[PDB]
């Protein structure tokens, strides 16, 4: 009985020793000669209004012009970022929404949250109205994040400490990913789309495989819940935002942490993390009413996106890298540039 | 300036804004009540007197109440509790008879300490509900309260404790300045529980109105 636990502990020690062996000059030693990105001043080009509650999620369409925002008001507004128009106002059934996702094709938006139901709304109906195409059920806990794969497969992360890949047409759990301990608070998909990483509240992140269906790698090094996660554009690294004010950028190939983006002036948690088009800049939705954008190669803070009157809950960067929407608990989106 | 399509799109945006404003006004006219509990404590009884989130819409005295029974959640409370930052009250059912059962009142008191002192609810009143009065009286007659509260000294008869459990629930409120933990023994009461809820919610609404107004 205890022999299995002893073998597991020995394997964990061996893995830690192997990682230590692969360790070398840190990212600071490599990118020490690189010049700093310089001060980044960023103006609120647009300020979308219309929500009557706290925004909990946002996502940029593939066209980088349309974004869908979910708020505890119960509404799923689809904005037109260029002109601050509202294309649609979906009346979500359950007002407790905590995620949203814009399908790559632009024909679907997903919403979920405390209802434990992932609803797949439709946008290109012949009747000119948004009709719930399918309401996925099966998660025994609050839904945290959902992301479309191409158009029919959608992966979800819920509070039952499991991630699942669905089949929208069938409405059944095609593959279930298990192995986490705490609530899986956030999810992110690799650009290659055959891999994705999830950050659970047990202070650990895992590298899942959509195809075969098991945790390829396990990453640790945090000290609190991982409230957000995002892939590096090259699809070989990801960054996690913990509750201890520490964005950490890991690597898939080396299976190690590279930096710990921390500052003593920050003592508040993290809500969202997203890179830039090249990944040189890494944003972060700190809950102390502002978002701090840091250089992802020297860990130096390089600008502050202040201007929100409450906690910055959701943050996202466009596909072309022309803007960074930040949705705060104040009922206001805000597109920066 | 704007082409025809752009003008019609702005028309659609104005219509969407009008619908959003109307629905927001309708929602604000309603009153939201989070309902916590220790589990089995009697939330069923009070919800009858009126997957995931189990809502309940009941109206009284031309006021639309919304009770969000959240006992079905099994995840960690710290992550989704901030969703209810805006509720005007927190009904908190507690099983009085459970003092000798298994020590469940210690768990209930721990939950009360977690909820009342939570950073998200520094200004939301707690409508404490003490029910199962008949069973509590029968048990108190059978056995004293020293099983769960050895520090208590008294005749160990009902109402001789002077709602001793109620006292221990009230003093658990650390921030007594910015909230009031209303208590009310929930017997059959001839449908007076809804009345107590109404007075408590009205008091909270008055406090909110005065706080907003200058």
């Amino acid at each position, epitope marked *: 009985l205890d022999q299995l636990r002893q073998e597991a502990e020995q394997l964990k020690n061996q893995i830690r020793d192997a990682r230590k062996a692969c360790a070398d000059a840190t990212l600071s030693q490599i990118t020490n000669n690189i010049d700093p990105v310089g001060r980044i001043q960023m103006r609120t080009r647009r300020t979308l209004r219309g929500h009557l509650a706290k925004i909990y999620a946002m996502h940029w369409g593939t066209d980088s*012009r*349309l974004l869908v925002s979910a708020s505890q008001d119960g509404k799923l507004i689809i904005w*037109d970022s260029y002109t601050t*128009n509202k*294309v*649609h106002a979906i009346p979500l059934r359950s007002s407790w929404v905590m995620t949203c996702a814009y399908a790559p094709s*632009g024909n679907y938006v997903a919403c979920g949250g405390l209802d434990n139901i992932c609803s797949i709304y439709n946008l*290109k109906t*012949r*009747e*000119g*109205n948004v009709r719930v195409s399918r309401e996925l059920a099966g998660h025994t806990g609050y839904l945290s994040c959902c992301r479309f794969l191409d158009d029919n497969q959608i992966v979800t992360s819920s509070g039952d400490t499991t991630c699942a890949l669905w089949d929208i047409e069938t409405g059944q759990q095609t593959t279930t990913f298990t192995g986490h301990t705490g609530d899986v608070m956030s999810l992110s998909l690799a650009p290659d789309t055959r891999l994705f990483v999830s950050g659970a509240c047990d202070a650990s992140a895992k590298l899942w495989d959509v195809r075969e269906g098991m945790c390829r790698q396990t990453f640790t090094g945090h000290e609190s819940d991982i409230n957000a996660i995002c892939f590096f554009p090259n699809g070989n690294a990801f960054a996690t935002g913990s509750d201890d004010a520490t964005c950490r950028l890991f690597d898939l190939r080396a299976d190690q942490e590279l930096m710990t983006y921390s500052h003593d002036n920050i003592i508040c948690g993290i809500t969202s993390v997203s890179f830039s088009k090249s990944g040189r800049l890494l944003l972060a939705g700190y809950d102390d009413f502002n978002c701090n954008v840091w250089d992802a190669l020297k860990a130096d803070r390089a600008g502050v996106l202040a201007g929100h009157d409450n906690r910055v809950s959701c943050l996202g960067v466009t596909d072309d890298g022309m803007a960074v929407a930040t949705g705060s608990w104040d009922s206001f989106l805000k597109i920066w540039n | 300036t704007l*082409s*025809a*399509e*752009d*003008k*019609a*799109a702005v*028309e*659609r945006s104005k*219509m969407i804004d009008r619908n959003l404003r109307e629905d927001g006004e309708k929602a604000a006219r309603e009153v939201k009540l989070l309902l916590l509990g220790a589990g089995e404590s009697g939330k069923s009884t009070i919800v009858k007197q009126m997957t995931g989130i189990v809502e309940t819409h009941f109206t009284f005295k031309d006021l639309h109440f919304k009770m969000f029974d959240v006992g079905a959640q099994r995840s960690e409370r710290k992550k989704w509790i901030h969703c209810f930052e805006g509720v005007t009250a927190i009904i908190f059912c507690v099983a009085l008879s459970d003092y000798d059962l298994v020590n469940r009142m210690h768990e209930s008191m721990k939950l009360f300490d977690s909820i009342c002192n939570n950073k998200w609810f520094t200004d939301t009143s707690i409508i404490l509900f003490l029910n199962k009065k008949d069973l509590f009286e029968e048990k108190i007659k059978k056995s004293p309260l020293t099983i769960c509260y050895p520090e208590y000294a008294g005749s160990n008869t009902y109402e001789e404790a002077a709602a001793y459990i109620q006292c221990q629930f009230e003093d658990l409120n650390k921030r007594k300045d910015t909230k009031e933990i209303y208590t009310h023994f929930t017997c059959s009461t001839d449908t007076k529980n809804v009345q107590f809820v109404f007075d408590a919610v009205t008091d909270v609404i008055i406090k909110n109105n005065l706080k907003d107004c200058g």
Partner: single-chain antibody, 233 residues
Framework: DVQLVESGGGLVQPGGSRKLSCSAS????????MHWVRQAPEKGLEWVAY????????YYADTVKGRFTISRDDPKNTLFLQMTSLRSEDTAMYYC??????????????WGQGTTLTVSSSDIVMTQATSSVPVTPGESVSISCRSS???????????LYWFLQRPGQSPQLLIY???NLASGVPDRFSGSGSGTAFTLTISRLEAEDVGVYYC?????????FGAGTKLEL
């Protein structure tokens, strides 16, 4: 299914009045703008009137300004056009067209069956030089419709639409915004061009594509249709 049936036709004495009504059927009428397009017994189409979503702003053609009145009844899902003092030239068969306006939408998506009416006895001038052109099946054809004003707005959109009308059939949309194919249309059709110069391109023209092809501006709201190019043989 989405279907638009309009009624209120029949012979009317000149100078009289008549109400024409459209009957919506299951396409969320209240959030759909509606137009009224007329077809002369031998000539091309011509815009008549328009009522926005929610009975908001409303426009008319210069030829029928004041004379005609258009109204909608959302609870009844029915669209009314009230005409007064019908003239001899007013004889035409009137089509009932829906259109929804938002980013990426497809205005003029569906056309009603049409109501035949007979009467007893700015303004960007679009042009279709080619009146007709025969073509054998399986070949590629190109129809050019030159405008008289730059249709490329500052937003980058090119507000040109292409409509194909089968013989004795309600016209249907083919391409909107000069490049975006309609939903359900075959991929053979393709539009291109530039400001003040457009040319629809169809490759491997199969059967059931013969008919009058119309081009349409949407910049200046006194819309104008093309003369119409017919495909034969």
């Amino acid at each position: 299914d989405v279907q638009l049936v309009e009624s209120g036709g029949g012979l009317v004495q000149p100078g009289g009045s008549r109400k024409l009504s459209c009957s919506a059927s299951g396409f969320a009428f209240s959030s759909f703008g509606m137009h009224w397009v007329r077809q002369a017994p031998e000539k091309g189409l011509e815009w008549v009137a328009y009522i926005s979503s929610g009975s908001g702003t409303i426009y008319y053609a210069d030829t029928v300004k004041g004379r005609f009145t258009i109204s909608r009844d959302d609870p009844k899902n029915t669209l009314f056009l009230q005409m007064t003092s019908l003239r001899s030239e007013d004889t035409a068969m009137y089509y009932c067209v829906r259109s929804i306006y938002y980013y990426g939408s497809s205005p003029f998506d569906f056309w009603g069956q049409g109501t035949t009416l007979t009467v007893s006895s700015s303004d960007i001038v679009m042009t279709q030089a080619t009146s007709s052109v025969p073509v054998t099946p399986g070949e590629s054809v190109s129809i050019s419709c030159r405008s008289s004003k730059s249709l490329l707005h500052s937003n980058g959109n090119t507000y040109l639409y292409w409509f194909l009308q089968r013989p004795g059939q309600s016209p249907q949309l083919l391409i909107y915004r000069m490049s975006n194919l309609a939903s359900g249309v075959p991929d053979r059709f393709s539009g291109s061009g530039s400001g003040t110069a457009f040319t629809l391109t169809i490759s491997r023209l199969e059967a059931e594509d013969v008919g009058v092809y119309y081009c349409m501006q949407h910049l200046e709201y006194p819309l104008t249709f093309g003369a119409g190019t017919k495909l034969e043989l």
